[PDB]
Assembly symmetry: C2
Homo-oligomer: 318 residues x 2
């Protein structure tokens, strides 16, 4: 046990709050037991000091506790796709699902409902869509109801805090494999190691150098890979994979991609979907993932999967 004042004092001494203390503390916060002023103080102390792997992991453990999980039965080849310009990850999710992955995605939510899908699915219905279509879209307000507790204080502070990086770690479907885009290059090495601490088996954490929370087409992408109990950092470029560099209609662009219309739009989707198939265990390499991704775009099966998903969400909510 630790009290909020003790935690504030600890950050004032520039010291880390230990994993077990952070668990105890975040539980009090998420239960609504800590005042806005005490929360903003603790969040600031953490931010000035900068947060450690232990602090982030302990906090994310509690965020998962307050999340509504999705209990999927067939956990073969899962990937949790998460991030921080059209809906690239949303388009890539149908491609990866067509190529053989079970794809869980957070939310994009605007894209799917203007495409025919229902968004207000209960966690039991997401489990059902994953089983039937290989696609699991998780509407954040449904799966993260306790975030309302700290929403006003976060809005008043305005600055980024630890909460800005905890959401992506929640993984409510419990995928062992994660594709995560991040906001800042520092977070590539941090989040890969937090994921390892949280028990992920495989992860790719990516930041495009042109400020993209995904594998970019306009610059190199920094990648942090968790594999076989180890984290390795490296950089990829579109040219490595045979792809040229590239500097209301977001649904138009999405739809043209699934129709196999060539262009930069298709290429960035094929790239990111490829990465998802690699981390899901379906593809031997990212390059191999891209090949698979292109084939399911070409045979129209990525399109068909979007349609099976929509149709599912409309039948389920009747």
């Amino acid at each position: 046990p630790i009290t909020p004042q003790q935690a504030l004092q600890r950050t004032i001494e520039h010291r880390e709050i230990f994993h077990d203390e952070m668990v105890d503390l975040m539980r009090q916060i998420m239960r609504g037991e800590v005042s806005d002023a005490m929360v903003s103080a603790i969040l600031t102390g953490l931010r000035v000091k900068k947060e450690t792997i232990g602090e982030i992991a302990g906090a994310a453990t509690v965020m998962r506790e307050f999340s509504r999980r999705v209990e999927v039965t067939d956990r073969r080849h899962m990937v949790d796709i998460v991030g921080t310009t059209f809906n690239i990850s949303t388009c890539a999710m149908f491609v990866a699902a067509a190529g053989g992955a079970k794809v869980a995605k957070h939310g994009s939510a605007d894209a799917l409902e203007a495409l025919g899908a229902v968004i207000e699915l209960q966690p039991e219905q997401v489990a059902a869509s994953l089983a039937q279509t290989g696609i699991g879209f998780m509407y954040a307000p449904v799966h993260h109801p306790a975030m309302k507790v700290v929403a006003p204080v976060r809005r008043e502070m305005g600055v980024r805090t630890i909460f800005n990086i905890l959401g992506p770690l929640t993984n409510p479907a419990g995928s062992p494999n994660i594709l995560m885009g991040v906001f800042h290059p520092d977070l590539v090495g941090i989040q890969a190691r937090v994921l390892q601490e949280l028990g992920a088996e495989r992860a790719l954490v990516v930041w495009g150098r042109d400020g993209m929370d995904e594998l970019s087409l306009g610059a190199g992408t920094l990648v942090g890979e968790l594999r076989d109990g180890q984290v390795h950092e490296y950089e990829v470029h579109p040219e490595d994979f045979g792809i040229a560099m590239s500097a209301a209609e977001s649904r138009a662009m999405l739809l043209q991609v699934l129709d196999n219309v060539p262009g930069p739009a298709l290429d960035i989707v094929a790239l990111n979907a490829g990465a998802a198939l690699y981390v899901a265990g379906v593809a031997d390499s990212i390059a191999d993932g891209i090949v698979r991704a292109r084939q399911v775009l070409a045979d129209g099966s990525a399109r068909a999967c979007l349609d099976a998903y929509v149709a599912f969400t409309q039948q389920a909510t009747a």
Copy 2:
């Protein structure tokens, strides 16, 4: 101009808020314009980073603006006595006033009213007591009404913040000379330099190594002296001045001192009153201040001054 969010972001980048920005910021805070959560965040960022001379001086400049000043006409040999076990400074104030200083003291307040004095004096009445008796006691709620604005957020945080060190800097009577006891040895060098920045002519800032906010009798005392545009730090011991070391009745102890009853109680008062006479410009040295202090204890004029003060406060408030 700076916004509270900009100030919070600045401390997050471990950077100092400049003197002019701090003035603008503290004015918004003291006007009640900044939410409790935003204030606690800014205070925490400042505390983790640790505050600079510029930040403290700019903030204290605003505290003075929101204070109710005392306009004393005869400013010869003034000393502002301020701090953070009986009422030593309160007892020393009558001794120093008897020895020739015009003494302004913050509040102790409990001691004086259980001695006959009225405490709720308006700043114009304090000016009158200083002119008549050489004693000016300033009841903090009267002179610092705006501190109510941040009192709840300070109470909720629990930890020390910059406000804990701004109060002693307010100097509502505008004495050029200050005797200040502090809470922590770091504050000796800090506060001497903040006082210089605020335009003090002379100061002694003291911390007893046994945890005393005054010149101690049970250990050495760290002293920071501002004199002639320069700050010098050194240590004093009771033995340096010919005083042996020493390891409801607070009014009894006070009263016996003014009655010239020898003991450790008298000695610590003579010591601190001596320091006050030195910084006020009355005495050539601290040692010389102690001699003067002992003489006004012995001739009963320190006692008479307490009585003149009480009588004044009872006549003024009728």
